[PDB]
């Protein structure tokens, strides 16, 4: 259990860090004023997993 | 101010902050 928590936590943070550089993430943020709920959904999914 | 400066020529806007609530 202890190691699994670290594994999941490291993966999600790395996914998020690299997701903010691709065009798709900032093209929408360019088009609208909000993130669109990516972080809220991403956080909720991570906890459930 | 940055957005206003670019408003004259280019349309690439930035992300503002308002109504945090």
């Amino acid at each position: 259990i202890e190691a699994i928590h670290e594994l999941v936590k490291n993966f999600f943070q790395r996914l998020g860090d690299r997701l903010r550089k691709v065009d798709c993430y900032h093209q929408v943020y360019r088009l609208v004023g909000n993130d669109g709920g990516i972080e809220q959904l991403l956080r909720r999914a991570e906890e459930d997993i | 101010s940055i957005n206003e400066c670019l408003k004259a020529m280019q349309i690439f806007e930035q992300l503002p902050v308002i109504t945090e609530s």
Binding site: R20 | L6, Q14, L15, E20
Partner: protein, 48 residues
């Protein structure tokens, strides 16, 4: 004078978004975190 010149500002804004995006996210998380805590003394005292 009409194509390359404006592109310089266009790329500048594209290179500014990656950091302006993080500052907004960081402040909102901290700001909304504090609002969760109560404000009245009566509610705060009961929590203790």
């Amino acid at each position: 004078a009409e194509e390359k010149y404006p592109e310089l500002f266009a790329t500048l804004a594209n290179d500014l978004q990656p950091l302006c995006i993080a500052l907004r996210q960081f402040y909102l998380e901290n700001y909304r975190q504090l609002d969760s805590q109560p404000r009245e003394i009566a509610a705060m005292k009961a929590q203790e």
